[PDB]
């Protein structure tokens, strides 16, 4: 189906559903909560989703957002993701699960229905991720089917970074371009049939999780889908 929206900033948060530890803050989406001294809270997850469902049959989309990672020391965790899932999708486990999976089933592709582009700040030993912080594409598993190194210069830069995520409904390809002002540029693509995974409705949004010493802020967000006909 066809849907489009635009948030140049989040001064208004009108069609955003917040769940878990996510909330609006200084014209941004704060995905994980902070305490009374502004310090990030350990072991929490939060979702900020666009509230209107849409369908993926015979559909392409493009979405772009700006984001900041704020870290308060060496070893931040766990990151955030832009994700697609059914409309009734709950906030799931905190930590390296990124609010998108449950421990039992997190690597079983036949027990999940979720697709994401993750920005991962913590190297999880528990499912032997690659030995660096990374950006990746997830298809029904916390183990990214495609993954690339995310430079620490850029993780810790505290720049306002830009992500472009796009899905070509004809070729069945999801792609992410990520860019940093005077920094690194990242490119990932994967062949995946989203209409086959999600035969019904879905929502798009952001999931963040701690972890420790980390807050994830979305500064701007636009989306357009169109039919491939």
């Amino acid at each position: 189906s066809e849907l489009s929206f635009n948030y140049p900033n989040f001064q208004s948060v009108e069609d955003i559903t917040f769940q878990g530890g996510a909330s609006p803050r200084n014209e941004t989406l704060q995905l994980t909560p902070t305490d009374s001294n502004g310090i990030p809270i350990r072991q929490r997850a939060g979702h900020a989703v666009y509230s209107q469902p849409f369908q993926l049959r015979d559909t392409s989309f493009y979405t772009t957002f700006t984001f900041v990672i704020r870290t308060t020391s060496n070893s931040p965790a766990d990151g955030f993701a832009i994700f697609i899932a059914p409309p009734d999708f709950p906030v799931k486990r905190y930590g390296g699960y990124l609010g998108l999976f449950e421990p039992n089933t997190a690597t079983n592709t036949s027990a999940n229905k979720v697709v994401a582009v993750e920005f991962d700040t913590w190297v999880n030993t528990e499912w032997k991720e690659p030995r660096y912080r990374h950006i990746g594409i997830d298809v029904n598993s916390i183990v990214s089917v495609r993954v690339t190194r995310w430079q620490d210069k850029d993780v810790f830069s505290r720049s306002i970074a830009t992500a472009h995520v796009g899905y070509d409904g004809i070729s069945k390809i999801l792609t992410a371009f990520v860019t940093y002002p005077d920094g690194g540029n990242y490119v990932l693509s994967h062949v995946v049939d989203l209409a086959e995974i999600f035969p019904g409705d879905v929502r798009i949004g952001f999931s963040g999780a701690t972890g420790q010493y980390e807050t994830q802020y979305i500064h701007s967000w636009s989306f357009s889908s169109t039919s491939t006909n």
Binding site: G95, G96, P103, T125, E126
Partner: peptide
């Protein structure tokens, strides 16, 4: 290292 399995 492992932190919650």
């Amino acid at each position: 290292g492992v932190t919650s399995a």
